[PDB]
C-alpha cells in the first residue's frame, strides 16, 4: 500500500521529532542542585575541548604597550577574528589569524581610552557595506566609527574604518563597559556609579537636534551610596539588559521601546542568599562574604524560565529564573529568583594521571576570577589559585547522557569537564566565540542537541585572549572523540576495540555509537592512520550493529543508526520550502552541494560493503523486514540526490522566467513545495516533471 521512499520518509519524520525532543534546560536544571561531572584529562581522546593553535601578540604592540605612560588595555573582537590594544589615547587593531598582521592604528583621540567595543549598526543609517560600528570611549568623550569587515580569500575579515562626525561629551561618569543590541542600540556603564547611559545617533542633521546624543536612563537623585558596575549584558531574545555591580547586585532592565529603558528588577546578594537558604542544600561556598564575578544571559530560545547564570568567586554557577506578574500587556519580568545551583567539580589538574552525594564543598574552582557561558552551556572558568598562572576549567553538557536519560524525572545537569593549562605568565583577559552562535532548534525543546548538528555546523571555537597571545579552543563532537579513540585501537586486539566501544555505548547508547562509527567510516572527522581508523569504524558498524528481532518487529541498531545519520544530513532541508518567491532558493546552493556529497558518500559506503553488511544483501520475518527497511532507506538516498540535482539544475537556468510562463495551480504547487514532498511524494515528482517539461520546450 505504501511504497519504499514513502516508508523511509516516515522514519525520517519520526527521527526529526526525536532529535527535536532533546530536553530543554529548564527540564534538567530543575529547582535544586547538582555536582555531576565526568572529568577528562586534557590529553585524552575523550577531552570535551582542546587547544588547536595559538597566535602571539605582534611585537609592535609590545613596543607600544611597554611604551605606555599611564594606562593600557587589551580586548577581543572574536566575531571577526580581530584583537585590539589601547595605549593611553591611541588604539591599535589587528587580525590575529594572520601570521604577520599589519596594525590598524587610530590615534585621533585626545584623552585616555577607557573602553572599546564593536557593535551592530543602526538600520537605515549607514551604507549597506558598513557591517559594524566601533565605539571608542575616552575620559572626555565617546566616538563612533563606521566599520566594514568584508571577508577575504584567506578567511579573515578585511577591516576599513570610516569617520562619522558622531560623538558626544562623556560627562562625569566613567565608561568601562559598552554593549550593543541586534538593532544597533548602544548602552554604556562604568566604575563611577551604577547608572546606564544610551547613545543615540541618526543620519540627518537638524537645527533642534544633533546627529549624536546621550542620555542617562537611571535618572538618579538624592542620597546615593558608593556602588559601581562590573559588567553589562544583553539578551535580544527578551529585550533585556542586565548589570552586575561591585556589591554583587543584579539589575534587570527592559527595552519597552526603541528608545526606552526601564528598570524592572533589582536583586541584591542578600536576596540571592535568602533564596539559597530556602533550598534543600546550603553550602559554605556561598555566603555574605562571597562575590559574584560574572553574569551570562540565557536566551529565550534556550530556556523559558531560566534567564541568567551568575558565577561566584568560589566557582558556583547560580541559575536564576525570572517571571512576569501577568501574561499580557515584549512582556517585562518583575521578579527574579535563584532556582538551581551547579556546584564545582572536585578533581584538580595534575601532571600525572590520578585514579553519589551532592558535592557542595569543593574548592577546585576557588578563586574564580573570570567566567563565561555560551549556548548550549559551554562553560569557561579562569581559576586563579596562584597569582602567576591561570588554570582554565572548561565543561560542556553531557549531551549523550542527557539525551538517553529516562524517565524525565531522572534528568540531571550531567557535564563533561577538563582542565586546560596556560603557561606561566599567561593572564587570561577575555574569551569570545569565533563561530556562529549554537542552535540545534528554534525553541528550548531540541535546542541543545549537539548530536543532531554534528554535520550541519562546524564545532564551536573560542578565542582565549591572554597578555601574550590568543589561544583557539575547539569543542569536540562525538565523532571527533570516537575517531580519536579508534585511532588508539589501531594497534591492539579484537577485544581492545570492543572495550572502547562499550564505553561509548554505556554513555551514548548503542544507536548513537553505531551512528558515530558509520559517520567516521564515511570520512566524518577526517577534515582534521585515517584509512585504518575508517576501516576500524567500518568494523565497529558491522560487528556491534545488532540484529532485528520479534517484539511488528524491532529493527537492528544498525538500521536506526543509518536512519539517524541520514536524517541529520538533511534536517535543514526536509521541511523547508524549495523556493522563495523574483523567485530564489530557500537553501543556498553551496549548502545543497555539501549535503548531496554527504548523502553520496554514505551511498558509496553501503555499495562498497553490500556483501559484508548484514541486511543489504537479500536473505525469517525479522531479517525480511530488516532487508525491506534498509532497502527503503537506500531508495530515499538516491531520491534525495536526484531531488537535489533537480533543484540545482533549476536555478542554473532562469527560474523567474520559467515561473512567469506558468499556470497558477503549478505556481501555487511550486510555492509551497517542500523538499520532503520532492523526495518522497507523488505530487512532488509530478511537479518536477512539469518544470523539466517546461524547460525542455523553450
Amino acid at each position: 500500500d505504501l511504497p519504499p521512499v514513502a516508508k523511509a520518509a516516515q522514519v525520517v519524520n519520526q527521527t526529526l521529532q526525536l532529535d527535536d525532543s532533546y530536553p530543554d534546560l529548564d527540564s534538567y536544571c530543575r529547582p535544586g542542585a547538582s555536582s555531576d561531572y565526568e572529568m577528562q584529562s586534557s590529553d585524552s581522546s575523550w577531552a570535551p575541548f582542546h587547544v588547536v593553535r595559538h597566535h602571539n601578540i605582534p611585537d609592535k604592540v609590545f613596543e607600544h604597550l611597554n611604551a605606555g605612560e599611564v594606562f593600557t588595555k587589551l580586548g577581543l573582537f572574536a566575531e571577526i577574528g580581530y584583537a585590539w590594544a589601547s595605549i593611553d589615547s591611541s588604539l591599535f587593531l589587528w587580525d590575529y589569524t594572520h601570521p604577520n598582521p599589519e596594525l590598524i592604528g587610530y590615534e585621533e583621540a585626545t584623552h585616555t581610552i577607557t573602553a572599546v567595543a564593536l557593535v551592530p549598526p543602526k538600520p537605515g543609517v549607514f551604507v549597506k557595506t558598513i557591517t559594524h560600528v566601533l565605539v571608542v570611549a575616552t575620559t572626555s568623550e565617546i566616538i563612533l566609527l563606521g566599520v566594514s569587515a568584508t571577508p577575504t580569500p584567506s578567511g579573515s575579515k578585511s577591516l576599513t574604518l570610516y569617520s562619522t562626525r558622531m560623538s558626544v561629551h562623556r560627562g562625569g561618569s566613567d565608561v568601562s563597559f559598552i554593549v550593543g543590541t541586534k538593532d544597533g542600540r548602544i548602552f554604556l556603564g562604568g566604575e563611577s556609579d551604577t547608572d546606564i547611559h544610551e547613545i543615540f545617533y541618526q543620519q540627518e542633521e537638524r537645527w533642534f537636534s544633533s546627529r549624536c546624543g546621550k542620555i542617562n536612563h537611571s535618572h538618579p537623585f538624592g542620597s546615593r551610596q558608593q556602588e559601581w558596575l562590573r559588567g553589562l549584558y544583553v539578551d535580544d531574545t527578551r529585550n533585556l539588559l542586565y548589570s552586575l555591580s561591585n556589591r554583587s547586585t543584579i539589575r534587570t532592565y527592559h527595552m519597552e521601546g526603541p528608545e526606552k529603558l526601564t528598570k524592572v528588577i533589582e536583586k541584591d546578594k542578600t536576596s540571592c542568599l535568602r533564596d539559597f537558604a530556602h533550598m534543600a542544600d546550603s553550602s559554605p561556598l556561598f555566603t555574605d562574604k562571597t562575590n559574584i564575578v560574572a553574569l551570562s544571559p540565557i536566551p529565550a530560545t534556550e530556556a523559558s524560565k531560566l534567564h541568567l547564570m551568575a558565577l561566584t568567586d568560589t566557582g558556583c554557577r547560580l541559575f536564576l529564573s525570572a517571571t512576569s506578574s501577568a501574561s499580557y500587556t515584549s512582556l517585562a519580568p518583575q521578579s527574579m529568583q535563584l532556582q538551581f545551583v551547579k556546584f564545582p567539580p572536585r578533581e584538580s589538574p595534575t601532571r600525572i594521571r590520578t585514579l553519589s552525594q551532592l558535592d557542595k564543598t569543593s574548592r577546585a574552582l576557588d578563586p574564580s576570577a573570570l567566567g563565561f557561558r555560551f549556548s548550549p552551556g559551554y562553560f569557561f572558568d579562569v581559576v586563579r589559585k596562584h597569582p602567576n598562572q591561570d588554570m582554565l576549567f572548561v565543561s560542556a553538557p553531557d549531551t549523550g547522557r542527557i539525551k538517553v536519560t529516562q524517565p524525565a524525572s531522572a534528568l540531571k545537569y550531567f557535564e563533561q569537564g577538563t582542565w586546560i593549562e596556560l603557561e606561566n605568565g599567561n593572564r587570561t583577559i577575555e574569551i569570545g566565540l569565533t563561530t556562529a552562535p549554537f542552535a540545534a532548534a528554534k525553541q528550548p525543546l531540541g535546542f541543545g542537541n549537539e548530536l543532531a548538528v554534528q554535520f550541519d555546523q562546524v564545532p564551536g571555537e573560542f578565542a582565549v585572549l591572554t597578555n601574550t597571545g590568543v589561544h583557539i579552543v575547539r569543542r569536540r563532537r562525538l565523532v571527533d572523540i570516537f575517531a580519536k579513540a579508534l585511532g588508539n585501537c589501531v594497534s591492539a586486539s579484537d577485544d581492545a576495540l570492543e572495550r572502547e566501544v562499550r564505553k561509548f555505548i554505556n554513555q551514548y547508547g548503542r544507536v548513537e555509537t553505531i551512528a558515530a562509527a558509520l559517520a567516521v567510516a564515511c570520512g566524518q572527522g577526517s577534515d582534521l592512520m585515517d584509512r585504518n581508523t575508517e576501516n576500524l569504524a567500518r568494523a565497529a558498524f558491522i560487528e556491534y550493529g545488532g540484529q532485528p528481532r520479534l517484539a511488528s518487529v524491532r529493527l537492528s541498531s544498525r538500521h536506526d543508526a543509518l536512519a539517524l545519520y541520514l536524517t541529520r544530513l538533511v534536517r535543514t532541508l526536509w521541511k523547508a520550502k524549495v523556493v522563495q518567491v523574483d523567485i530564489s532558493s530557500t537553501i543556498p546552493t553551496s549548502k545543497l552541494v555539501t549535503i548531496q556529497e554527504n548523502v553520496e558518500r554514505l551511498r558509496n559506503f553501503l555499495e562498497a560493503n553490500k556483501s559484508t553488511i548484514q541486511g543489504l544483501a537479500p536473505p525469517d520475518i525479522a531479517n525480511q523486514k530488516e532487508h525491506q527497511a534498509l532497502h527503503a532507506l537506500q531508495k530515499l538516498m538516491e531520491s534525495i540526490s536526484e531531488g537535489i540535482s533537480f533543484v540545482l539544475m533549476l536555478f542554473d537556468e532562469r527560474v523567474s522566467d520559467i515561473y512567469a510562463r506558468l499556470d497558477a495551480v503549478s505556481q501555487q504547487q511550486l510555492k509551497d513545495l517542500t523538499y520532503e514532498q520532492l523526495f518522497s511524494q507523488t505530487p512532488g515528482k509530478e511537479l518536477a516533471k512539469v518544470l523539466v517539461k517546461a524547460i525542455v520546450n523553450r
Partner: peptide
C-alpha cells in the same frame, strides 16, 4: 600607519 578614515559621505546614506 594611521588608518585611512574614508569620508562620512560614503558611510551614511542617502
Amino acid at each position: 600607519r594611521k588608518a585611512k578614515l574614508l569620508p562620512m559621505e560614503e558611510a551614511l546614506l542617502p
